[PDB]
């Protein structure tokens, strides 16, 4: 699925950062 | 060949990917690792524009999208499950289905973690004897041995009491609806008696 | 006697996805029966006609101009 | 019991989807629903591809929740067949609905089976005399063939099939099976009482001496049940043909209801519709039924299948597909039923493969072809009689008009079962007598007889007898009408003496409706 269980992903809920930290520096030469 | 059964059945074509993902990560017992990885990918889609351009643009070729999702997910300790999932979902342009495959995966894991949510909405901040007496009356609405959590919201429209929001059933034990059903019960008798 | 016998019952509710052309695509209602008389919040009744896998089709016994999404 | 216990996924009317975790059933197999009010039997029609079958429900789906467990039987819908079913009424799943205990079952046969092959077919042509004049004259019924009674909505194809039951089904020697596919429930109760009163159905412990098995899925049943009751009647008849090895009868009422039930189901399976609104698989479903009703080498099934036409339309595809599967066709028309003719057999559209000069004789064949020729030359002149009148025709044409008006009235016949509402007693005509009668009217031996003497009489004696009766009563006259009504000696009492004889009923205080509503 509904909208009520899909709006609640707009708030951050990872509780770990081992993916969004490293690949944020890799993505820009990958699209370059 | 031998896949463990999902705790609750679900819908098609986006919930089936979540069913297969829960089955595979339950064969590997990484059921909370890949949930964290999918949450990280949701926020990663939120952060940058060159990644959501891989899911909303229809003029990106599938070769560069497959090679970008492989060469990005080569490293950083990513699971084999999430890597092969994103490879298969980027080969077919199904990266926009991430936001509604992870919700069905969360419903599946919430069925497994044996934990059901609720939300009690009130008028005053609850005190500790109000709360421990609330849990005994709200547990009688669950149907097995679960871990029903109790969320708190405050809304001044109720004149005391509590309303339980289970996201599928609603128990209105409030006084504002008690007096609302009271004034409806009188006026059906004054017109008659 | 109405207060000493007053238990507010648990009610399984569901949202409305879309309304138009004499149907109400109702989200949820996992415990509804095919042909069960459902009752909207505006008072107008309905019948759970098409129990689909992802919603419940509800025809509206009355004017559907009082029914919104949500 | 985690595996082999599926749950209901979705419900669209009479179409139920079951989703399994493993070992989906084969198509055309029967499922059982756990915790339903009646025993609701599903039947798998498709595989939807997400571990999901798409079932047709043999009862109502009102009250199905999308969490109900559904077990598998691992078999199709299997009905109790044997000699013990003789005298029982069965629904589409083989239960007795006549309340006489369970069915004494020799074997339990499924309703889905392959048709008998090409080498098992029999090629035999012997006549079946029915006593009706139009059937035994213009389209003689094959003994062991297929018979379709077309025509729709009040032309008399359900009266005609009761007349065929009453004529052939008692002088046959073999068994009979009546399969009521979507006709009235009242008609099934009428046939049940009329077969108990006639002795082809017996009750008690002497049930086995009966000669008729009833299978009813009548028109109150949901479209899952009406699509399968013809197959159940076929399984009951095919046990007698295939295992008992003896010749039966199989009167299927309203075989259009089979095609219509499959069209009501196939609207909700999401298939693209064919011509005027039917399913795409009309011809194959009707072939897979109708090719099972065949006479093999070991036995015979002589079927009389009433075929309802929609809105009197023979170019509708549901009867026009059925026209190819029938040996002898008996088309009924409403334009002849509005002329008072009964049975309203259309003589220039009802054909048979038995009408051949090598089989039934050149005398019967030439009489039938002459009758068809006279009626067709009459039908060519109908507009000329309409606008220009009878007073300008040729001599030969206004002789063929009189001969055709005599044979149209002569083809009508009072029925042995229709006298409940018409008064005229029914006349069972022999074959050679009606052949000789139509030979006489074709040659012209009865030109000077009145036309209404031919109406509603059995054979060539009774037309001259009705001419003598109806041409007495135009010249019959009595003088003073011989009343002797007044002054009857100790016969008529007074009016108040007859009033005092009447017992008086009491009036029980204004409908008593509250006393027998607070009782429950
Ligand atoms: N041989 C007949 N003689 C007189 N009336 C008939 C005859 N056959 C049929 N009818 C009339 O047709 C009516 C019923 O037709 P029916 O057999 O029910 O056709 P259908 O089943 O298509 O409606 C009866 O009320 C009856 O009056
Ligand atoms: Mg009828």
């Amino acid at each position: 699925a509904d909208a009520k269980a899909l709006d609640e992903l707009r708030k951050p809920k990872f509780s770990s950062k081992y993916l969004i930290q490293h690949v944020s520096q890799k993505l820009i030469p990958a699209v370059k | 060949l031998k896949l463990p059964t999902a705790p609750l059945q679900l819908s098609g074509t986006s919930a089936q990917i979540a069913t297969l993902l829960w089955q595979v990560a339950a064969k590997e017992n990484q059921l909370d690792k890949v949930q964290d990885e999918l949450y990280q990918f949701i926020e990663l889609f939120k952060q940058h524009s060159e990644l959501r351009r891989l899911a909303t643009d229809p003029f990106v070729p599938t070769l560069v999208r497959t090679k970008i999702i492989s060469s990005v997910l080569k490293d950083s300790g990513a699971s084999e499950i999430t890597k092969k999932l994103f490879e298969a979902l980027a080969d077919e342009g199904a990266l926009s289905a991430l936001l509604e495959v992870t919700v069905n995966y969360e419903e599946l894991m919430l069925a497994h973690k044996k934990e059901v949510y609720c939300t009690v909405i009130t008028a005053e901040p609850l005190d500790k004897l109000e709360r421990v007496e609330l849990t005994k009356k709200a547990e009688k609405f669950v149907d097995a041995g679960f871990k029903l959590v109790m969320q708190e919201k405050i809304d001044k429209k109720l004149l005391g009491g509590f309303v339980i929001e289970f996201s599928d059933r609603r128990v209105d034990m409030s006084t504002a609806k008690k007096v609302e059903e009271f004034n409806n019960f009188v006026n059906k008798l004054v017109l008659s008696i | 006697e109405w207060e000493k016998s007053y238990q507010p019952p648990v009610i399984h509710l569901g949202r409305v996805l879309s309304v138009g052309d004499g149907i109400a695509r109702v989200y949820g209602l996992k415990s509804v029966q095919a042909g069960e008389l459902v009752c909207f919040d505006s008072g107008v009744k309905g019948m759970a006609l098409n129990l689909q896998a992802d919603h419940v089709g509800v025809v509206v016994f009355g004017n559907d101009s009082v029914i919104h999404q949500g | 019991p985690a595996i082999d216990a599926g749950y209901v996924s979705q419900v669209i009317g009479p179409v139920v989807d079951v989703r399994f975790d493993g070992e989906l059933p084969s198509i055309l197999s029967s499922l059982e629903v756990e915790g339903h009010s009646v025993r609701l039997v599903l039947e798998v029609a498709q595989h939807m591809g997400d571990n999901t079958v798409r079932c047709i429900a043999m009862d109502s789906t009102d009250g199905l929740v999308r969490g109900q467990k559904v077990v598998d039987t691992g078999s199709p819908i299997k009905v109790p067949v044997g000699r013990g079913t003789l005298g029982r009424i069965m629904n589409v799943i083989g239960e007795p609905v006549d309340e006489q205990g369970p069915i004494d079952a020799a074997d339990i046969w499924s309703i889905h089976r392959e048709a008998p092959e090409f080498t098992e077919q029999s090629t035999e042509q012997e006549i079946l005399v029915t006593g009706i004049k139009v059937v035994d004259l213009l389209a003689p019924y094959q003994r062991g063939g297929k018979i379709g009674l077309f025509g729709g909505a009040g032309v008399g194809k359900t009266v005609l099939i009761m007349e065929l039951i009453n004529n052939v089904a008692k002088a046959h020697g073999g068994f009979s099976v009546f399969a009521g596919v979507g006709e009235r429930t009242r008609e099934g109760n009428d046939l049940y009482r009329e077969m108990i009163e006639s002795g082809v159905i017996k009750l008690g412990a002497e049930r086995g001496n009966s000669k008729c098995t009833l299978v009813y899925g009548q028109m109150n049943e949901p479209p899952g049940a009406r699509a399968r009751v013809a197959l159940t009647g076929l399984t009951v008849a095919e046990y007698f043909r295939d295992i008992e090895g003896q010749d039966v009868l199989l009167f299927v009422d309203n075989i259009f209801r089979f095609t219509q039930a499959n069209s009501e189901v196939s609207a909700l399976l999401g298939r693209i519709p064919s011509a005027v609104g039917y399913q795409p698989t009309l011809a194959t479903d009707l072939g897979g039924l109708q090719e099972r009703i065949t006479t093999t080498t070991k036995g015979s099934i002589t079927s009389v299948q009433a075929v309802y036409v929609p809105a009197d339309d023979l170019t509708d595809p549901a009867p026009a597909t059925t026209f190819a599967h029938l040996d002898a066709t008996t088309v009924l028309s409403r334009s002849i039923a509005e002329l008072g003719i009964y049975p309203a057999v259309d003589p220039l559209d009802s054909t048979s493969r038995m009408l051949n000069p090598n089989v039934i004789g050149a005398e019967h064949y030439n009489v039938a072809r002459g009758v068809q020729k006279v009626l067709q030359d009459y039908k060519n002149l109908q507009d000329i009689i309409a606008i220009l009148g009878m007073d300008e025709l040729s001599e030969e044409d206004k002789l063929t008009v009189a001969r055709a008006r005599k044979i149209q009235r002569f083809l009508s016949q009072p029925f042995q079962v229709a006298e409940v509402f018409t008064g005229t007693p029914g006349k069972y005509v022999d074959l050679a007598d009606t052949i000789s009668g139509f030979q006489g009217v074709l040659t012209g031996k009865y030109d000077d007889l009145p036309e209404m003497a031919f109406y509603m009489v059995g054979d060539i004696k009774e037309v001259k007898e009705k001419a003598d009766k109806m041409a007495k009563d135009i010249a019959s006259r009595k003088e003073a009408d011989n009343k002797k009504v007044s002054e009857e000696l100790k016969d008529i009492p007074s009016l108040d003496k007859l009033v005092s004889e009447i017992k008086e009923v009491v009036i029980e205080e204004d409908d008593g409706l509250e006393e027998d509503f607070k009782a429950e």
Side-chain angles (χ1 to χ4, degrees), chain D residues 151-159 183-184 342-343 413 415 418 421:
Chain D
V155 295
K157 53 165 176 309
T158 317
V159 168
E183 265 288 275
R184 306 173 179 89
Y342 279 113
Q413 173 176 336
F415 275 166
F421 54 90

Side-chain angles (χ1 to χ4, degrees), chain B residues 29-191:
Chain B
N29 303 85
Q30 325 173 13
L31 283 172
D32 299 308
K33 174 84 172 181
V34 295
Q35 188 170 356
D36 205 310
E37 280 176 323
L38 288 191
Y39 273 138
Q40 275 161 105
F41 269 104
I42 291 310
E43 269 283 327
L44 184 57
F45 271 122
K46 275 193 66 49
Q47 287 295 142
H48 326 299
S49 294
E50 279 101 7
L51 202 73
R52 64 162 94 95
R53 204 167 173 256
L54 307 178
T56 193
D57 200 275
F59 296 96
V60 52
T62 191
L63 206 50
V64 307
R65 179 179 54 238
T66 317
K67 276 177 296 189
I68 277 183
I69 295 296
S70 51
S71 44
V72 159
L73 273 77
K74 185 224 312 181
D75 306 294
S76 68
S79 191
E80 191 85 47
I81 324 292
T82 307
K83 275 165 61 188
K84 274 177 159 280
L85 170 70
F86 268 81
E87 154 191 298
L89 288 189
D91 190 310
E92 317 296 324
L95 296 180
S96 86
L98 185 68
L99 269 73
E100 72 176 45
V101 72
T102 181
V103 182
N104 292 86
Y105 182 66
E106 283 139 19
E107 293 184 9
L108 270 173
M109 201 40 201
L110 261 51
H112 173 54
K113 273 162 135 205
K114 291 304 297 274
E115 63 185 342
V116 77
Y117 284 99
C118 70
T119 313
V120 48
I121 179 162
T122 329
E124 315 154 342
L126 284 87
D127 211 354
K128 74 167 294 300
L129 199 139
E130 182 89 351
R131 187 173 289 105
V132 306
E133 262 196 350
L134 188 66
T135 59
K136 323 291 201 318
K137 288 146 64 178
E139 201 270 345
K140 294 199 175 177
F141 305 139
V142 317
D143 49 357
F146 271 86
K147 293 179 179 179
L148 62 80
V149 314
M150 294 300 293
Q151 262 335 133
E152 287 91 1
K153 297 294 177 55
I154 308 299
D155 193 294
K156 197 175 180 179
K157 287 200 65 71
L158 275 64
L159 272 78
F162 56 93
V163 177
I164 313 292
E165 290 281 341
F166 274 124
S167 73
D168 59 278
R169 52 202 181 273
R170 197 196 77 198
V171 185
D172 206 307
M173 291 213 51
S174 65
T175 79
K177 199 182 182 296
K178 173 184 182 63
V179 70
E180 204 269 342
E181 294 286 340
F182 186 80
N183 293 349
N184 295 155
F185 189 73
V186 166
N187 286 121
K188 302 315 171 320
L189 290 183
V190 185
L191 275 164

Side-chain angles (χ1 to χ4, degrees), chain C:
Chain C
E1 70 178 359
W2 183 88
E3 278 191 353
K4 71 155 299 182
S5 288
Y6 178 55
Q7 175 90 325
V10 52
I11 173 62
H12 320 271
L13 79 163
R15 299 304 192 274
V16 167
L17 295 171
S18 88
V19 162
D21 299 333
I23 203 188
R25 298 275 159 105
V26 172
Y27 174 79
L29 282 169
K30 313 191 304 165
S31 317
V32 82
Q33 310 180 334
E36 179 166 356
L37 181 80
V38 302
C39 180
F40 286 78
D41 196 54
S42 179
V44 57
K45 295 280 184 189
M47 167 170 56
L49 178 54
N50 306 273
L51 257 59
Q52 298 258 20
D54 38 352
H55 51 244
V56 170
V58 161
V59 294
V60 178
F61 290 154
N63 207 20
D64 75 311
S65 293
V66 302
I67 301 180
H68 316 85
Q69 170 177 6

Side-chain angles (χ1 to χ4, degrees), chain D residues 241-256:
Chain D
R241 181 202 67 200
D242 274 29
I243 302 304
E244 315 282 344
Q246 77 188 272
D247 313 329
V248 303
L249 289 156
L250 185 61
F251 315 97
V252 168
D253 212 355
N254 263 1
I255 201 54
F256 176 78

